[PDB]
Design a binder for this molecule. Structure first.
Ligand code: TBA
Ligand code: CO
Lengths: 103, 219, 106, 103, 106
């Protein structure tokens, strides 16, 4: 397989790891902060997906510094990863057009 | 099987400090939290704090005076609460529970009755209570036995080692002059006695004693 | 702390009737409420979780309802073994908290 | 190093500057507006990151015109910068595929 | 303006007892509340910040709790030097505001 497809897949694997690790660490960081909602695993994992996609529902968010750090890693992971998929798709389209052009 | 094992009781002197334990079994996850809950006699439940043993991170109820320190031993899967510089205020049952990081207390320990006074451990004396010989009888008969002169609480009174369950009352202890006293009461059909034995068993955790006696008829 | 209010403290109903304990929360907590039974000398026993979800080992006649700030624990057909204290407990926000307790008597 | 990698790095440096400057300016613009929450530095900086990633938690936002201006600079900085990373990744994938093709 | 309510105004406790001052906020402000001591003639002295965080130079027996709209300043083991006025102060929204003050007396 071509690099850009491997990378896509790799990123997917990397993203899912980040989501899991992140939701587990988020709960760890948040319990002990009064008023915190990011304190059970199930909804923390859902919070990971919201965060990495930037879906923006605003129903859960971290209030501690370390929870916020965790969140930044998940945003960047998500944004980069999905951006990588666009790159991978552009590489395919570009290769195809060279062919269709006789180049 | 039973999943959280706590010692029955702990006598502590004013100013002293005790270390309660809570021994786990069944499905361990590293995502498991262990919680500690305080219940004063009469009052309700009060969250003290939590620990994730597979990491050692502990959080505490900040609304109340910090008396506790949480620790765990990953290998024996035992959580320790370290209550210190105690007063009568701290006399209570302390439960430990387990939460799978989803917000609810699936299982609870049976509790540890921490008592705080200067007074000394006294195992109970257990005296039978069978009817006097000039007492008539219905299809049913009431026996019992009397746990007297012990400190501190609690005592578990069973009948035929828990095999004989219905018919049983066990009255709340009265305290008087630094010793506790209660009677437990049992009721069986009158054909079934003494033909078939009826024995009250009395564990007193604080003194690690566990006596019992048969309820034989008089003269 | 989220405050949970269980009022009344004592509820007195007749054998086999249906009974409802309420838990009111000081702010809105979705369905993150859990219900425990505690009989005299016993330790708490989880009856219902997340407002309405049943637990293995609990009689069918226990059920729960509510969301937000209003919650209800119901027993279809009360019977002697149900005589106990009943507590609610929230997991929406840290720390977890407990209701003051309601005692059922028949 | 290739331009696209330099640019990526440059953008990262530019983004972080924008986040800092922006959180400091946001507080400056917002204090004096009744009901404003974007008024201390720590959480303002966290607000910068939320803004530039568009994570969408909705826990903090500006209410003054100048705070809103500041926010627009941070959105564009973030969106462009992360978009630049996709571009940089596409350039790599595209170069690799030309090689793998014997072109 | 966020309004902060410190009630009661005067709190009277016995030597060495534990005491709790409350600050209630007119809307929800997370943990953005800070506590100050002011003795007769002195200027205010920051005791606790962000609801519960301790300050260098303050006795251990001072602590704080709460989040949202309910806040508590506690002194384990009151003693004469604690006789003072106590103010709460919020930094959630502009402008910053102050509680009316609670005077401790032994
Ligand atoms: C279809 C919604 C895409 C949202 N994006 C990309 C997120 C990729 C997971 C947010 C980027 C924030 C830096 C792009 C906004 C482009 C205006
Ligand atoms: Co060419």
């Amino acid at each position: 397989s071509a690099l850009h497809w491997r990378a896509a897949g790799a990123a997917t694997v990397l993203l899912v790891i980040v989501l899991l690790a992140g939701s587990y660490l988020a709960v760890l960081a948040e319990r002990g902060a009064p008023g915190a909602q990011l304190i059970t695993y199930p909804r923390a994992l859902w919070w990971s997906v919201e965060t990495a996609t930037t879906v923006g529902y605003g129903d859960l968010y971290p209030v501690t510094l370390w929870g916020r750090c965790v969140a930044v890693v998940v945003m960047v992971a998500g944004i980069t990863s999905f951006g990588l998929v666009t790159a991978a798709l552009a590489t395919w389209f570009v290769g195809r057009e060279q062919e269709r052009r006789g180049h | 099987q039973v999943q959280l094992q706590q010692p029955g009781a702990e006598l502590v002197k004013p100013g002293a400090s005790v270390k309660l334990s809570c021994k786990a079994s069944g499905y361990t996850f590293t995502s498991d939290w262990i919680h500690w809950v305080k219940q004063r006699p009469g009052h309700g439940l009060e969250w003290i704090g939590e620990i994730i043993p597979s990491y050692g991170r502990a959080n505490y109820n900040e609304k109340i005076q910090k008396k506790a320190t949480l620790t765990a031993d990953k290998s024996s899967s035992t959580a320790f609460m370290q209550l210190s510089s105690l007063t009568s205020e701290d006399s209570a049952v302390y439960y430990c529970a387990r939460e799978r990081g989803d917000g609810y207390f699936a299982v609870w320990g049976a509790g540890t009755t921490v008592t705080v006074s200067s007074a000394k451990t006294t195992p109970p004396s257990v005296y039978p209570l069978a009817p006097g010989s000039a007492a008539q009888t219905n299809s049913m008969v009431t026996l019992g036995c009397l746990v007297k002169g012990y400190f501190p609480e609690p005592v578990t009174v069973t009948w035929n080692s828990g095999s004989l369950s219905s018919g049983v009352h066990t009255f709340p202890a009265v305290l008087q002059s630094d010793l506790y006293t209660l009677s437990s009461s049992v009721t069986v059909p009158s054909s079934s006695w003494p033909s078939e034995t009826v024995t009250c068993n009395v564990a007193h955790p604080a003194s690690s004693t566990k006596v019992d006696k048969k309820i034989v008829p008089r003269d | 702390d989220i405050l949970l209010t269980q009022s009344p403290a004592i509820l007195s109903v007749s054998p086999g009737e249906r009974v409802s304990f309420s838990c009111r929360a000081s702010q809105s907590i979705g369905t993150d409420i859990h219900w425990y039974q505690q009989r005299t000398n016993g330790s708490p026993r989880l009856l219902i979780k997340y407002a309405s979800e049943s637990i293995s080992g609990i009689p069918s006649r226990f059920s729960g309802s509510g969301s937000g700030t209003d919650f209800t624990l119901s027993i279809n057909s009360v019977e002697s073994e149900d005589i106990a204290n009943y507590y609610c407990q929230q997991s929406n926000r840290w720390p977890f908290t407990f209701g003051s307790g309601t005692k059922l008597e028949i």
